[PDB]
């Protein structure tokens, strides 16, 4: 909870949002400050928002994007992965799809795949 | 300042220190997050210093190479130094040899001069 990095088990890459070029993605390598997110509990029990730069990570059924608006599609639940203690899938409430990656892009996927396992750890 | 099970990850490349007992393999890895990257960070017998342990062994520096130790020798004692412009990151300073935990390629090394590759974040594994 609070400021955190969001790192993928499969490749060690971290989600980032760069406001200076409006670039959302996943990056493997150096730990830049645009990889630091605000992970906050939402109004609805069991659901969270993932935010940077006054925007929220959302999935609109077509793309994973950043939203200025705290709307339904910004709600995510954590889903335990028993084989990998400390890792979670991030499941979008509205569209029931998992946060995933394809190359350097964040995507959503209803299938359960090895690239959907994330660890959220304190930035400071 | 995490105490207990943690990953030890480098700011410069996102790589994680690891020790695999079966393969007797110590290094840093920039790919997938495996179980053997989870360390036990504990307070030592001497205040101000910590041990860094896996598989009933301890990370040490003997003045030549960074290696594991079966026993908590003086060479297994490390202090934390905050990195001035990177809150959450630390240099790990070996007590006996005054050398900072560092890396070169896939290997852990130690260096007495402060450099850009010595910044570690120690984050809870669970
Ligand atoms: Cl960018
Ligand atoms: Cl980045």
Residue numbers in the entry:
A (entry chain B): 6 to 129
B (entry chain A): 4 to 129
Sentences from the paper on this structure:
SeviL is a recently described lectin, of uncertain biological function, isolated from mussels. Here we have shown the protein is a dimeric member of the well-known β-trefoil superfamily. The β-trefoil fold shows pseudo-three-fold rotational symmetry, with three subdomains of the protein (called α, β and γ) that each contain four β-strands. SeviL is the first lectin to be described that shows an exquisite selectivity for asialo-GM1 over the closely related GM1, suggesting it may well be a useful tool in ganglioside research, and especially in studies of NK cells, which are currently of enormous interest due to their central role in the control of cancer by the immune system.
The two monomers in the dimer are closely associated by hydrophobic interactions and hydrogen bonds involving 11 residues on each subunit. Gln 12 and Phe 126 lie close together, and their side-chains lie opposite their symmetry mates at the dimer interface. Met 36 (and its symmetry mate) contributes the largest contribution of buried surface area of any residue at the interface, becoming entirely sequestered from the bulk solvent. The buried interface area between SeviL monomers is 780 Å2, but too small for PISA28 to predict a stable dimer with confidence. Within the apo crystal structure, a crystal contact is formed with Arg 26 of the B chain approaching within 3.6 Å of its symmetry mate. Two nearby balls of electron density were modelled as chloride ions, which would counter the repulsive charge on the two residues (SFigure 2). One chloride ion sits in a hydrophobic pocket formed by Phe 21, Phe 32 and Tyr 37; it comes within 3 Å of the side-chain of Asp 39, which also lies close to Arg 26 from the neighbouring molecule. No chloride ions were modelled near the A subunit, and it appears this interaction is unique to the crystal form, which was crystallised at pH 3.5. Comparing the main chain atoms of a single subunit, the apo and liganded forms show a rmsd of up to 0.36 Å, depending on which subunits are compared, indicating that the protein shows no movement on ligand binding. Least-squares comparison of the dimer in the apo and liganded models gives a rmsd of 121 Cα atoms (residues 9–129) of 0.53 Å.
